[PDB]
Amino acid sequence: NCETSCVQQPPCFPLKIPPNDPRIKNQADCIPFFRSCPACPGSNITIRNQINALTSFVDASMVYGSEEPLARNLRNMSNQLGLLAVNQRFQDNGRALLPFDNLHDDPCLLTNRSARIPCFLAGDTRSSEMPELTSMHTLLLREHNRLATELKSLNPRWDGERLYQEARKIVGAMVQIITYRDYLPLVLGPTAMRKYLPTYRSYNDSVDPRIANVFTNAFRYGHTLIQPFMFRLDNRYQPMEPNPRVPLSRVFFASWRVVLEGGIDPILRGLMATPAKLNRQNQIAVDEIRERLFEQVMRIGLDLPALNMQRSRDHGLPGYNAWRRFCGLPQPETVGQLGTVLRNLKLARKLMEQYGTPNNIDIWMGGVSEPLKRKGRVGPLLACIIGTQFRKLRDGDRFWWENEGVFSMQQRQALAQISLPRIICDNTGITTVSKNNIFMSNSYPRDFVNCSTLPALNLASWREA
């Protein structure tokens, strides 16, 4: 139905095509869209609401899975070493790749037909969507097995269950540290970080840790960071010939590229030594996602920004001004007031031409339109929403890594040494990595150091007598 039909019948909500579209000349066509599953299907009484299929917590559930059967399928159950399952047919210069998934309709197979490389199996279903994503999944798989290995050597009496859990808990903590120490400050900027993420006191069981429906749309700010190519670099950080710069419309679900075009190392180097796209008010999102999203595996190229806005309507999200008010920010009524708020009268004029009032601006569009907080990559609205979400995820998490009783004070001192560059050194053939904060460092060789200069994670306080 909704993949090939342009008829608007439940559960399909196709995006209609305007006159004089620059790409889709056929106005009878549409962009496919399935409405998100309701929590209470068929109900006349309830106000429709969507479902989160994952654990809201920062617990590396994209590695381990969010359901018990998946979680056991991701494990290596042929021994007691506490390992995650790895690809049995392919390796990456001797290292683990993710196992292959068995999908009824596998999009990855459609990218390179001769190659016949299916999508990967991971804690989350989207691991194959970009090879850059896949590389990060693969990195964390390896880091689990590395930690489990090291702990086995440290504690020979530990069984597979104990090893897996202890490794899992460490990976969880590493995701939390990189997120809150390194990543979020560069999203929010210092003012908003101080405001929304003040110093951790302790676990608070009255903080609701659920993902808010609005966050599912607000946190798509990152679509403005996307670069129209996948960049691959050799061990000298030079272009890996023959295809150093692949258009993104040729990497979506392209699992074969990880397996057959040289593994994760060239992709990770590209991630480290290429800039993100800057979000600017006149350069919101690139045509590889706006015009060609998933065009290799589907009848038509999607528009990710358009999908975001359709999705906010699907989810019943209030418009820009209601979220400004929620956040305690002024609500502009007029084009002139919106000009002040956006520091951009021209963009204000465009938004009012489309929407008629700032009350009706879709949250993503409004969010990403705001000028960026100093040293952040979102404006005040998105910083409020994103900041509030992540505060709830920290303070309402009983297993937050700093919470009394989760780690010993020695394990905490050890975990504070972790960094994403170190993880890359420990699990790839890469010997030169981003310095500093990895998320700011972007230029080889200026921003790079030898792996030997970086402190490893010392697991000695996980020794058990």
């Binding site: 059967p69 056991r72 399928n73 159950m77 042929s78 021994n79 007691q80 399952a85 790895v86 690809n87 049995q88 047919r89 196992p99 292959f100 998934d101 068995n102 999908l103 009824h104 199996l121 597979g160």
Partner: protein, 57 residues
């Protein structure tokens, strides 16, 4: 439901005569949680979900 390709390696362990008896029972237990109660059930599930199982005679 679907049989996973990496689970083919477990069929090998269950057939390895020299594989530890505890090791086999942990895999037998894993497959029982998925409704597969003999090695014949495991091999037949792998067949139906698309894998070459001809190497098991």
């Amino acid at each position: 439901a679907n049989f996973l390709e990496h689970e083919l390696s477990y069929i090998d362990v269950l057939l390895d005569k020299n594989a530890d008896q505890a090791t086999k029972d942990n895999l037998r237990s894993y497959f029982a949680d998925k409704g597969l109660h003999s090695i014949k059930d495991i091999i037949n599930k792998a067949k139906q979900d698309g894998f070459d199982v001809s190497k098991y005679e």
